[PDB]
């Protein structure tokens, strides 16, 4: 049981790293795709909200 | 004579019991320590190996 817990401990850091990396790559896709989709066209949403 | 005869048997029976029981001590301690060390060995065989395989 303790060895299973210890393996999960290493997996827990790996799982958190995997989740953070996946979400950061999803964000960077927006960041990379932002230049092609439009660099400064985001002001339209803010004008409607404000 | 009766007092001496009783004393001889009492002296013969008094001493040897502790020495004979000491024959227990070696074997019983060896068994108990070996089995506790086997418990430790069973605990340690999984601890390192499962972590290495889980890596």
From Swiss-Prot, chain B:
Superkingdom is: Bacteria
Q: Where in or outside the cell? A: Cell membrane
Coiled-coil stretches, from where to where?
none
What does it do?
F(1)F(0) ATP synthase produces ATP from ADP in the presence of a proton or sodium gradient. F-type ATPases consist of two structural domains, F(1) containing the extramembraneous catalytic core and F(0) containing the membrane proton channel, linked together by a central stalk and a peripheral stalk. During catalysis, ATP synthesis in the catalytic domain of F(1) is coupled via a rotary mechanism of the central stalk subunits to proton translocation.
Task: Report quaternary structure and partners.
Answer: F-type ATPases have 2 components, F(1) - the catalytic core - and F(0) - the membrane proton channel. F(1) has five subunits: alpha(3), beta(3), gamma(1), delta(1), epsilon(1). F(0) has four main subunits: a(1), b(2) and c(10-14). The alpha and beta chains form an alternating ring which encloses part of the gamma chain. F(1) is attached to F(0) by a central stalk formed by the gamma and epsilon chains, while a peripheral stalk is formed by the delta and b chains.
Q: Which family does it belong to?
A: Belongs to the ATPase B chain family.
What is the name of this protein? Answer: ATP synthase subunit b
Included range, full protein: 56 to 110 of 164
